[PDB]
Design a protein around this ligand. Structure first.
Ligand code: TMP
Length: 561
DNA sequence: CTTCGG
């Protein structure tokens, strides 16, 4: 009697079947099978639409997804002819919930099911995973459901208020709204910024040997040099033109540069954006394909941990392919659960050898591979130099450095300012002085890169949710991406102001981050899901009830006049 | 009309 192994996608089914013997039949569910209604007397109508009942202790009406009836039948029919069912969904909470939905729709004794967990699809990982199969974790499922229901309530109860008060078709979302707020705030900072004039002066000189030495003026009378207009710069240039220049100090020190940690979801998104020009969506879609194909570890992670076997494999690669000088004494540890960073499943698999992956996916694999190999290599070593020069009442500086050992940079694609030899007390001959006018700059616009970064920093959102927050926002008319930077739209500003005014708690960054903590508490049996939802709902209805009132009574302002 | 996840 064979066993039934169920996964989310045909691609994952294919890969996992490579490592499962004849006693297993693998089948995919082709994505989610059940969720809240697709949605296509007033309270009753609302509950019907939501698919959840906040007033009746969160009773839910899960419905099989449009067009999934046939796979459910295929699955039930296959479930019959099996002696055990292994739920092999992805390792995160959403994956736990999908496994749960499968178990619920298929039915049977819970003892007929096992939940297997792995962070990559390789022979050895599948072996370990099936050698020690666990049970469905209901706390993690409930944490998912809690998130799901909260999101649903906000969306379906706040949005209709927006239709009445501002405009039809608008949306609000527990997360989407807070993300928009960040962009709107940045927009207003930029619009309010008043740039200030400041000047710099550089000096080109020659050493006693005749070599060029470029210096920057740093101090005048022992105070930082920063003239604010042309008059002041010219007065300074006048003095600098006549001064005698000499080297006050030469400071030589060895410096190093360290490789970064291996990627996690947020840093991968950032590096793929800045280095490859890939949008967050593209990146996550390709990462998922690489993972389901068995080439990298799971792509939703916030851990920088590396298994002992993974570290062994990469140190072996470094020793064989770069040499002893590139291998640290002991492995580099980057951590702080059984989770791991985003890394190649097999270090001897090169991006060029990837089967059935487009060029851009190979480029992402390369990005991941290089980061993983580099993170276990030695630091690059430099000989840095700082020269301090005196000229009458002025102080000037020049900094340089020469690479002495490439270390981890050897694995990066194949250039430092070098300073001439001079000794303390040497006279320098002035050749030219170049003043330059500059102005202060407003805060930088959010890039798709910096935004993810900001959400992480504030504890808002998670690896499973940093994804495609940046699509509707744009569809929706709230913010738009232009020339690789975000711009708030007026409707974004209009909605944000209204939400901040009447849904202060919901829009508050710290409260939003706290909710992620609350959900983790549920996942870890430190809180109960319906109680957590009860508290959320009590606070939410307080805001909503008030928001619905006339503005004269403190309700949300209409979008008009 | 709408949520987050796809
Ligand atoms: C979809 C989903 C996944 N995850 C991911 C991150 C972790 O790898 C894992 C959660 O582990 P945990 O349930 O023990 O906290 O699932 C969340 O934390 N929250 C979610 O809502």
């Amino acid at each position: 009697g064979k066993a039934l192994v169920i996964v989310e996608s045909p691609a994952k089914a294919k890969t996992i079947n490579k490592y499962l013997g004849s006693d297993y039949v693998v089948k995919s569910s082709v994505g989610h099978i059940r969720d809240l209604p697709t949605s296509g007397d007033e309270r009753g109508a609302l509950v019907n639409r939501m698919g959840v009942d906040p007033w009746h202790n969160w009773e839910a009406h899960y419905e099989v997804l449009p067009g999934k009836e046939k796979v459910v039948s295929e699955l039930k029919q296959l479930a019959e002819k099996a002696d055990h069912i292994y739920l092999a969904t992805d390792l995160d909470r959403e994956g736990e919930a999908i496994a749960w939905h499968l178990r619920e729709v298929i039915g049977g004794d819970d003892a007929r099911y096992s939940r297997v967990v792995f962070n990559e699809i390789t022979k050895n990982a599948i072996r370990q995973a099936f050698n020690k199969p666990g049970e469905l974790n209901i706390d993690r499922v409930n944490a998912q459901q809690a998130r799901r229901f909260m999101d649903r309530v906000v969306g379906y109860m706040v949005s209709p208020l927006l239709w009445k008060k501002i405009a039809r078709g608008l949306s609000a979302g527990r997360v989407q709204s807070v993300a928009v707020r960040l962009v709107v705030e940045r927009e207003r900072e930029i619009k309010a910024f008043v740039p200030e004039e400041f000047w710099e002066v550089d000096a080109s000189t020659t050493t006693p040997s005749g070599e060029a030495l470029a210096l920057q003026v740093t101090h005048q009378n022992d105070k930082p040099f920063r003239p604010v207009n042309k008059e002041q710069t010219q007065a300074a240039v006048s003095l600098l033109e006549k001064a005698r220049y000499s080297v006050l100090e030469r400071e030589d020190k060895p410096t190093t540069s360290k490789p970064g940690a291996p990627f996690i979801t947020s840093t991968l998104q950032q590096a793929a954006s800045t280095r490859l020009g890939f949008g967050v969506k593209k990146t996550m879609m390709m990462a998922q394909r690489l993972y389901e194909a068995g080439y990298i570890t799971y792509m939703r992670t916030d851990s920088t941990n590396l298994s002992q076997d993974a570290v062994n494999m990469v140190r072996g690669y470094i020793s064989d392919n770069f040499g002893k000088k590139y291998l640290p004494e002991s492995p580099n540890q980057y951590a702080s659960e059984a989770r791991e960073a985003i890394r190649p499943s097999d270090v001897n698999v090169m991006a060029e050898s990837l089967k059935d992956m487009e060029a851009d996916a190979q480029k992402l694999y390369q990005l991941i591979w290089r980061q993983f190999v580099a993170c276990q290599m030695t630091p690059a070593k430099y000989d840095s130099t700082t020269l301090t020069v005196g000229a009458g009442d002025f102080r000037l500086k020049a900094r340089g450095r020469i690479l002495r050992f490439d270390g981890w940079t050897k694995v990066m694609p194949a250039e430092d300012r070098i300073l001439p030899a001079v000794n303390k007390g040497d006279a320098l001959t002035l050749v030219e002085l170049t003043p330059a006018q500059h102005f202060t700059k407003p805060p930088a616009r959010f890039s798709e890169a910096s935004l993810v970064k900001e959400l992480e920093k504030r504890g808002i959102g998670r690896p499973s949710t940093y994804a495609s927050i940046i699509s509707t926002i744009q569809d929706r008319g709230y913010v738009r991406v232009e020339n690789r930077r975000f711009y708030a739209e007026k409707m974004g500003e209009i909605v944000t102001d209204r939400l901040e005014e009447n849904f202060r708690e919901l829009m508050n960054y710290d409260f939003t981050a706290q909710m992620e903590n609350n959900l983790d508490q549920v996942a870890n049996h430190e809180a109960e899901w319906k109680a957590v939802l009860d508290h959320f709902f009590s606070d939410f209805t307080q805001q909503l009830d008030k928001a619905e009132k006339d503005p004269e009574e403190g309700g949300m302002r209409p979008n008009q006049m």
